Motif scaffolding. Structure first.
Motif, PDB file in Angstrom:
ATOM      1  N   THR A 181       0.827  -1.199   0.000  1.00  9.56           N
ATOM      2  CA  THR A 181       0.000   0.000   0.000  1.00  9.56           C
ATOM      3  C   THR A 181       0.870   1.261   0.000  1.00  9.56           C
ATOM      4  O   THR A 181       0.549   2.247  -0.666  1.00  9.56           O
ATOM      5  CB  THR A 181      -0.962   0.006   1.209  1.00  9.56           C
ATOM      6  N   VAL A 182       1.980   1.218   0.730  1.00  8.15           N
ATOM      7  CA  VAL A 182       2.896   2.354   0.806  1.00  8.15           C
ATOM      8  C   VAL A 182       3.748   2.490  -0.459  1.00  8.15           C
ATOM      9  O   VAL A 182       3.883   3.582  -1.013  1.00  8.15           O
ATOM     10  CB  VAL A 182       3.828   2.243   2.028  1.00  8.15           C
ATOM     11  N   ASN A 183       4.323   1.377  -0.906  1.00 11.89           N
ATOM     12  CA  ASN A 183       5.238   1.378  -2.043  1.00 11.89           C
ATOM     13  C   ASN A 183       4.544   1.468  -3.403  1.00 11.89           C
ATOM     14  O   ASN A 183       5.138   1.930  -4.378  1.00 11.89           O
ATOM     15  CB  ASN A 183       6.118   0.126  -2.011  1.00 11.89           C
ATOM     16  N   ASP A 184       3.295   1.017  -3.474  1.00  8.56           N
ATOM     17  CA  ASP A 184       2.596   0.941  -4.755  1.00  8.56           C
ATOM     18  C   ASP A 184       1.372   1.855  -4.810  1.00  8.56           C
ATOM     19  O   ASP A 184       1.337   2.796  -5.600  1.00  8.56           O
ATOM     20  CB  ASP A 184       2.190  -0.508  -5.047  1.00  8.56           C
ATOM     21  N   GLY A 190       0.489   9.458  -5.388  1.00  6.76           N
ATOM     22  CA  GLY A 190       1.240  10.585  -4.868  1.00  6.76           C
ATOM     23  C   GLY A 190       0.674  11.079  -3.551  1.00  6.76           C
ATOM     24  O   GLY A 190       0.916  12.216  -3.146  1.00  6.76           O
ATOM     25  N   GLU A 191      -0.076  10.211  -2.877  1.00 13.60           N
ATOM     26  CA  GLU A 191      -0.702  10.553  -1.604  1.00 13.60           C
ATOM     27  C   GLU A 191      -1.226   9.305  -0.894  1.00 13.60           C
ATOM     28  O   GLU A 191      -1.655   8.350  -1.543  1.00 13.60           O
ATOM     29  CB  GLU A 191      -1.852  11.546  -1.816  1.00 13.60           C
ATOM     30  N   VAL A 202      -6.811   8.838   1.420  1.00 12.79           N
ATOM     31  CA  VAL A 202      -6.398   7.447   1.277  1.00 12.79           C
ATOM     32  C   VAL A 202      -7.032   6.880   0.009  1.00 12.79           C
ATOM     33  O   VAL A 202      -8.252   6.780  -0.076  1.00 12.79           O
ATOM     34  CB  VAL A 202      -6.812   6.600   2.494  1.00 12.79           C
ATOM     35  N   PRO A 203      -6.206   6.520  -0.987  1.00 15.92           N
ATOM     36  CA  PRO A 203      -6.730   6.058  -2.280  1.00 15.92           C
ATOM     37  C   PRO A 203      -7.530   4.767  -2.177  1.00 15.92           C
ATOM     38  O   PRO A 203      -7.280   3.946  -1.296  1.00 15.92           O
ATOM     39  CB  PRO A 203      -5.467   5.833  -3.120  1.00 15.92           C
TER      40      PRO A 203
END
Ligand SMILES: [Zn+2]
Length: 335
Positions: A181-184, A190-191, A202-203
């Motif tokens: 979730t953080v890396n991809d 971009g957020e 949060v996408p």
């Protein structure tokens, strides 16, 4: 009992994106309840275990009430419309209280309350054994709704029986975003960025680690508890981890890869161990359950995988329910 634990392991996937936190204004007007908040330590959004538990409890108690067609005055008592709390949390209490009951409280099943025994209770919050409180207009309902279940004169006797705190059988781990979730996901959008100690969001598709620990206390209520625990998660899926005034907020999926059990006896011989998640579990899961790749394996007595029950890397809460007979049969309880 004897004791020990069953641990649900997987992750939460958001079907919709969300804001981070809420506002003073919305908090004042009683509008948006949003459990997704900023973590002071990591700087990333996450869902606190207590918020998940609270939300699951709030939705389950309502569903439990309506499924048995119980009028809210009876179900919530002096709490009016939320936070049902009773002391019928173990069968002893009911047996001990039976003599003073004209009729069974309708929210009881085999003598105990699923809501309170699973999600905890401060005691007789509804004031079942407190008619004075009930009948007071300012402090209660202005009348006693429990007349048909018990004599108000037997309330003081009941008050020594049915007003005992209970620790919740379930505990939710703080749900932090997975490495994927953080890396991809976060990176693609971009957020959000690392903001330690809105206008970031949060996408959709974001994933947060899911660990839920259930404490086995009563073998006879084991399967029933799992059904209701799963059901509460299903309710959170249908209605959101949070809510606005009008509709649910924060649509989520509970992707549960395994039920991991450890009995009290097993602690005497830990070596009879099934590990999870192992390398095989990680290859089998992610991209479907990304949290597993962030985990080192842990030792359990028996690990029930979705893969054991179905050609799947994970099962949804409602799917676990449908196969609970099958699941409990493999667990180290109920012979
Ligand atoms: Zn209760």
């Amino acid at each position: 009992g004897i004791g020990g634990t069953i641990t649900l392991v997987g992750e939460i996937r958001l079907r919709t994106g969300t804001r981070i936190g809420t506002s003073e204004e919305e908090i004042e007007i009683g509008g948006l309840d949003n459990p997704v908040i900023r973590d002071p330590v990591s700087g990333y959004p996450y869902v606190p275990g207590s918020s998940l538990k609270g939300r699951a409890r709030a939705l389950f108690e309502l569903a439990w009430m309506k499924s048995r067609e119980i009028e809210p005055d009876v179900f919530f008592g002096a709490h009016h419309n939320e936070r049902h709390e009773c002391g019928f949390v173990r069968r002893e209490v009911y047996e001990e209280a039976k003599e003073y009951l004209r009729e069974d409280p309708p929210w009881l099943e085999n003598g105990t309350c699923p809501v309170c025994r699973i999600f905890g209770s401060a005691g007789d919050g509804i004031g079942f054994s407190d008619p004075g409180r009930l009948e007071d207009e300012r402090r209660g309902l202005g009348y006693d709704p429990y007349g048909r279940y018990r004599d108000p004169n037997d309330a003081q006797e009941l008050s020594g029986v049915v007003d005992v705190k209970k620790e919740a059988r379930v505990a939710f781990r703080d749900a932090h975003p997975t490495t994927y979730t953080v890396n991809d996901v976060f990176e693609r959008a971009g957020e959000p960025t690392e903001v330690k100690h809105s206008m970031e969001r949060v996408p959709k598709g974001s994933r947060f680690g899911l660990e839920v620990v259930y404490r086995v206390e009563d073998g006879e209520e084991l399967e029933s508890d799992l059904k209701y625990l799963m059901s509460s998660l299903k309710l959170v899926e249908d209605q959101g981890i949070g809510h606005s005034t009008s509709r649910g907020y924060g649509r989520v999926e509970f992707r549960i890869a395994a039920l991991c059990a450890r009995s009290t006896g097993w602690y005497l011989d830990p070596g009879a161990g099934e590990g999870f998640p192992e390398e095989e579990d990680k290859d089998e899961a992610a991209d479907e359950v990304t949290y597993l790749s962030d985990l080192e394996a842990e030792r359990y007595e028996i690990v029930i995988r979705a893969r054991d029950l179905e050609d799947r890397a994970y099962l949804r809460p409602e799917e676990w329910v449908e196969r609970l007979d099958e699941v409990v049969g493999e667990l180290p309880w109920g012979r």
